[PDB]
RNA sequence: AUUUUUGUGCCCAUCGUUGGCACUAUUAAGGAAUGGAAUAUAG
DNA sequence: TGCTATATTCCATTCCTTAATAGAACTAGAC
DNA sequence: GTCTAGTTCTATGGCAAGGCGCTA
């Protein structure tokens, strides 16, 4: 029901005196010295847990109670680290000498585990524990006691308390609640609720409870059954009942009995440690006299990768055995038959070392339509030998194996298209033994392989130490509070300063570490974003209200551009070049203020301070929770499908409609509101720039640039390409490079590909790479039109930055290639050259915030038109696209890096976060199957309705990949993608529509195509065919889904000419949306 | 408590007219891929 | 018109997932 | 009277394809 996130401001911080921020240093390192302290003694506490203390435990999500030892009694950690190292082989023996039995499956399946050998080892924690009994000189039976408590108290094991929680109880000596007290309170609730079984009213109850602590009021229950903390939910019931909020509530006894019950196991005892005085006396002698603020954040800071490893590797083991349990071992066998391939003559290799095969080896499944054809060639080859062939069998048997050797290199290039390519020599051998193994098995057995592989590499998480961070706030926390606005205006009127000021001022109550006494600071922020969205004070009186969602933004209702004063405008001009951007913000702010627009933020201790010291610098972040409570009663609905190349799309779907553009969608009333691109315009003058889209100046403007590109890849004209047999082939790259010096070509697109031809130009001149250092500075770092200074977030500006940086790689690896002492490392490189290491390191920091942009502006766009939306409509239901496991082994290279750049998940990811804080907007991701090739509003409603994806162009720039294309849908041999079938009929309409027979496309002359089609236009004055391309931009919809379609008669039917997106928008929209009204 | 010069970043043949924008921080591991040099193979 | 293919080693990278942190409500006692 | 510094609180579809571009 409820919803929460943060959002978080981060901030330089202002120092102050070198001894103040010296005191504030002094604290920092005192808390992250301490640290790993409560992380070894953690550790120590978890190897002393056993049978006995989790004995009758909840034990949930199926964890058994050999793998809650087991995580407790060993972990793997890193080599040098103080724990001792254990053999894997040992483990089992370790823990039947420490449980009195043999390890079940879980904790089996635990300690196979792979993890890195040379940087982790299992440890064993047991000893762990055993060394503190000794050290501190504790009996095994007041530990094990303590241990117990502390079990219960939930300090170790499975679901821990808070670090507040767990300090306190253990280490706090302020008075504690008589337990006892509320046993017997508890008890009577239950009995008396017991004797009287079947009350109905609030009422009631609370008489009973009343009764149960012999009291007439809830303050006197308080008082003396539960005198400090938080209510019992118990005694909450009678604090509403006078209160009067709870009287028609319903009562279940039953749960009231069940839940009472079960909070009785903690109030059996009173929590009377016999060792925690000496492990206090220890933590004193290591991190100083006990404070709850400062142990608290000490222990948070140990505990999390100690209870978060345990959780993560629990969760891990139970997948693994559901994972080895898919694996078919009765094909195994089959396994063998296909690695014998490794013993066979096919493969034979220098060492004979072998490697793992994968389905994509023998080109996953379609070796069977590679099977029916080799048989069909053999079963044909038989009767030739029978009776066609009679003595002279010796050249028709050599003619069978040409045949099987080429259907089979005919199908792995045929393969090698669209994928890896499969391996000759391994469905050679496999056919040699086609009476050994069916082709079924062969698969079978190879899947076996693989899965077996990949299964039993998946490593097991190491528990590593965290690096710290602590926090300070208004509550449970080390003491700190942000100076309030309204304090603020107090403060600086007290010292006779300007009414308002642009930094942010914290008070936190710190150690001194000279006297280990506490003392409250105050120092000094800044941040711009937190003075627009928060702080900056509305002074002015009757200003704007408080926006239903907090903060001061531009999403969020306030476009915060006011007119600026005369003299406001020259601060800005006469600012610094470097400070000219903040001031001009803060100008913007102050205006805002004076002039009444700036809207109020409603003050609350609602904001942490987070402080993470990095040697010298502090990095001190504000955190604020977000409340939100769903509403699924949605009006609007508004799919979004993500794209590479093309641009992202959405579309927004009105539920429940009525009126003119209604269609009935299987009894739902649903209407088209709109469809769009999302584009990130930015105005340069009065010219805009999409940053989503746009590739770069055109060389028109460029001709110094591009001149002096040519000037230095004349100077390294040589090449010479790939030995087909001992041919060394003469290479011009000057042919290449003028393919894209045209004026027409954009700069973006030009740099990208000259990267890749110095790439190849260094490659044939490895010797004399140290030449190449200054052209690659001018192209990426120097130059005007330089990679570093001109780049959109286009998907080719992001190619650009990846083969610039593959450029830079070609350039080291040649550079200190060895004439023929170990592998060159970046040690080696940045001592060989720092600028172009540098370089190298400039364009990678360029490139992640390139990206982390691109998530932020494409999420805004997502969100704002949802909002947009929701203002008119109601709620929204924002639909994307659930994207997973794209890049794969089985795929080619260059699919994996194309496939890379996609971004849908970090985008996706993004637009969760941001929908948390906004009332009447969620997010779901739906399955995107088919969302290419549905015609939405038709599809399902009620017949299952596919097409093809269409492309677009003139005769003129048909290609012969666009014949081959439209050639490949019309073949009639059968496939098991279901998209095919669209294909196939979108060729049968094309040919129907503009009056062909395959015999005018296939095998005639590309140029006779061309004309064929240039004719049969003009007659009908039309610039251009339609044909079915896969990854084709239109679509030919029914309904009318992108403002700008026209019409078409395709196949005597009528159909929009769509942007194939914006329909693909809609279908996301579609996908299951009677679930989300059912 | 006063620093008054900065929260992080994004775009451009014109880097400014107030140029135009956007944004949850951190810690750690794991998962799946990618680039470069070279080796071994079959083409 | 051409973007050779598989597999491995070593040095490097990016995109994403999943374990965590960024406590609430309270009162006795100190101002 | 407000606030600090301590305590205790917590609640009852099987697969596998599909979803992604080239420039020129």
Not at 175 to 195: D, G
Not at 253 to 264: D, G, H, Q, R, Y
Not at 395 to 401: A, C, G, N, S, T
Not at 743 to 755: G, Q
Request: proline fraction near 4%; charge should be positive; charged fraction near 30%.
């Amino acid at each position: 029901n409820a919803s929460e996130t943060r959002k978080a401001y981060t901030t330089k911080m202002i120092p102050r005196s070198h001894d103040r921020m010296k005191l504030l240093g002094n604290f920092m390192d005192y808390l992250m010295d301490g640290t790993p302290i409560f992380f070894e003694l953690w550790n120590q506490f978890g190897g002393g847990i056993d049978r006995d203390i989790i004995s009758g435990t909840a034990n949930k999500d199926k964890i058994s109670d050999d793998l809650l030892l087991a995580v407790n009694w060993f972990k793997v950690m890193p080599i040098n680290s103080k724990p001792q190292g254990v053999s894997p082989s040992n483990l089992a023996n370790l823990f039947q000498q420490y449980s009195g039995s043999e390890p079940d499956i879980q904790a089996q399946e635990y300690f196979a585990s792979n993890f890195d050998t040379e940087k982790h080892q299992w440890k064993d924690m047991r000893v762990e524990y055993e060394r503190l009994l000794a050290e501190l000189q504790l009996s095994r039976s007041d530990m094990h006691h303590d241990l117990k408590l502390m079990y219960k108290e939930k300090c170790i094991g499975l679901s821990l308390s808070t670090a507040h929680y767990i300090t306190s109880v253990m280490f706090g000596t302020g008075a504690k609640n008589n337990r006892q007290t509320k046993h017997q309170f508890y008890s009577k609730v239950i009995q008396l609720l017991e004797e009287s079984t079947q009350i109905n009213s609030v009422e009631q109850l609370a008489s009973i409870i009343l009764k149960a602590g012999d009291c007439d009021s809830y303050r006197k229950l308080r008082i003396r059954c539960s005198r400090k903390g938080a209510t019992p939910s118990i005694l909450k019931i009678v604090q509403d009942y006078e209160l009067g909020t709870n009287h028609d509530d319903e009562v279940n006894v039953p749960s009231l009995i069940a839940n009472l019950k079960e909070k009785l196991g903690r109030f059996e005892y009173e929590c009377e440690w016999k060792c925690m005085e000496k492990i206090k006396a220890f933590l004193a002698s290591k991190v100083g006299p006990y404070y709850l603020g400062s142990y608290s954040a000490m222990l948070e800071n140990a505990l999390s990768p100690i209870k978060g490893m345990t959780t993560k590797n629990c969760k891990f083991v139970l997948k693994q055995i559901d994972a080895k349990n898919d694996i078919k071992y009765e094909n195994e066998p089959f396994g063998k038959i296909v690695e014998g391939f490794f013993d066979s003559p096919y493969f034979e290799s220098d060492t004979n070392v072998k490697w793992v095969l994968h389905p994509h080896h023998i080109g996953e499944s379609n070796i069977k339509t590679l099977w029916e054809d080799l048989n069909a060639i053999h079963s044909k080859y038989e009767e030739d030998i029978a009776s066609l062939s009679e003595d002279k069998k010796e050249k028709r048997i050599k003619v069978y194996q040409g045949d099987v050797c080429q259907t089979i290199n005919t199908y792995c290039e045929e393969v090698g298209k669209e994928a890896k390519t499969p391996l000759v020599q391994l469905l050679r051998y496999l056919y040699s033994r086609k009476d050994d193994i069916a082709v079924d098995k062969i698969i079978d057995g190879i899947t076996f392989l693989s899965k077996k592989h990949k299964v039993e590499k998946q490593k097991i998480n190491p528990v590593i130490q965290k690096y710290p961070s602590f926090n300070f706030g208004n509550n449970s926390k080390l003491l700190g509070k942000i100076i309030s606005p309204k304090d603020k205006l107090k403060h600086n009127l007290k010292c006779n300063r300007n009414q308002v000021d642009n930094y942010i001022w914290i008070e936190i109550k710190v150690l001194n570490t000279k006297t280990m006494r506490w003392e409250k600071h105050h120092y000094a922020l800044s941040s711009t974003r937190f003075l627009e969205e928060v702080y900056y004070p509305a002074t002015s009186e009757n200003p704007p209200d408080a926006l239903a969602a907090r903060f001061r933004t531009k999403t969020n209702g306030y476009e915060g551009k006011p007119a600026l004063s005369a003299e406001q405008i020259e601060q800005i001009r006469s600012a610094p070049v470097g400070l000219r951007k903040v001031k001009k913000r803060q100008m913007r702010l102050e205006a805002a203020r004076q002039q009444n627009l700036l809207p109020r933020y409603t003050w609350g201790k609602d904001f942490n301070i987070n402080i993470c010291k990095r040697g010298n610098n502090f990095e001190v972040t504000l955190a604020t929770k977000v409340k939100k409570k769903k509403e699924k009663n949605y009006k609007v609905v508004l799919g979004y499908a993500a794209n590479i190349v093309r641009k992202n799309t959405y579309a927004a779907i009105e539920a429940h409609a009525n009126g003119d553009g209604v269609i009935d969608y299987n009894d739902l009333p649903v209407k088209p509101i709109e469809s769009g691109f999302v584009t990130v315009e930015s105005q340069v003058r009065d010219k805009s720039y999409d940053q989503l889209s746009y590739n770069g100046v055109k060389l028109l403007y460029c001709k110094p640039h591009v001149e002096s590109r040519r000037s230095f890849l004349e100077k390294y004209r040589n090449g010479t390409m790939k030995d087909n047999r001992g041919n060394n082939i003469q290479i011009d790259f000057m042919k290449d490079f003028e393919a894209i010096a045209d004026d027409e070509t954009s700069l973006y697109y030009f740099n990208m590909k000259y990267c890749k031809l110095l790439q190849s130009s260094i490659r044939n001149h490895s010797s004399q790479a140290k030449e190449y250092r200054e052209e690659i500075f001018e192209l990426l770092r120097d130059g005007k039109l330089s990679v570093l200074k001109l780049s959109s977030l286009s998907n080719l500006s992001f190619v650009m930055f990846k083969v610039a940086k593959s450029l830079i790689g070609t350039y080291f690896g040649h550079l200190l290639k060895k004439p023929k002492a170990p592998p060159i490392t970046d040690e080696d490189k940045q001592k060989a050259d720092p600028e172009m290491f540098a370089l190298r390191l400039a364009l990678e920091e360029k490139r992640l915030n390139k990206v982390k942009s691109k998530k932020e502006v494409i999420a805004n766009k997502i969100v704002a038109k949802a909002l947009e939306l929701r203002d008119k409509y109601g709620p929204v239901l924002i639909k994307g696209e659930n994207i997973s496991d794209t890049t794969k082994k089985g795929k080619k290279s260059s699919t994996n890096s194309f496939l890379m750049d996609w971004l849908a998940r970090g985008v996706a990811n993004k637009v969760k976060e941001m929908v948390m804080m906004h009332q009447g907007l969620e997010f779901v991701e739906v399955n995107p199957n088919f969302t290419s090739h549905q015609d939405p509003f038709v599809h399902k409603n009620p017949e299952n309705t596919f097409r093809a994806r269409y492309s677009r162009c003139t005769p003129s720039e048909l290609t012969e990949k666009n014949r081959k294309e439209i050639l490949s849908f019309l073949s009639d041999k059968p496939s098991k993608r279901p998209t095919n079938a669209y294909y196939n009929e979108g060729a049968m309409a094309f040919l129907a529509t503009y009056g062909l027979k395959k015999n005018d496309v296939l095998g005639v002359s590309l140029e006779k195509f061309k004309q064929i089609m240039a004719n049969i236009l003009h007659q009908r004055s039309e610039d251009q065919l339609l044909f079915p391309s896969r990854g084709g931009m239109f679509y030919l919809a029914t309904y009318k889904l992108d403002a700008d379609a026209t019409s078409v008669n395709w196949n005597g039917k009528q159909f929009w000419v769509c942007n194939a997106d914006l329909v693909a928008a809609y279908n996301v929209g579609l996908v299951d949306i009677q679930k989300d009204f059912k």
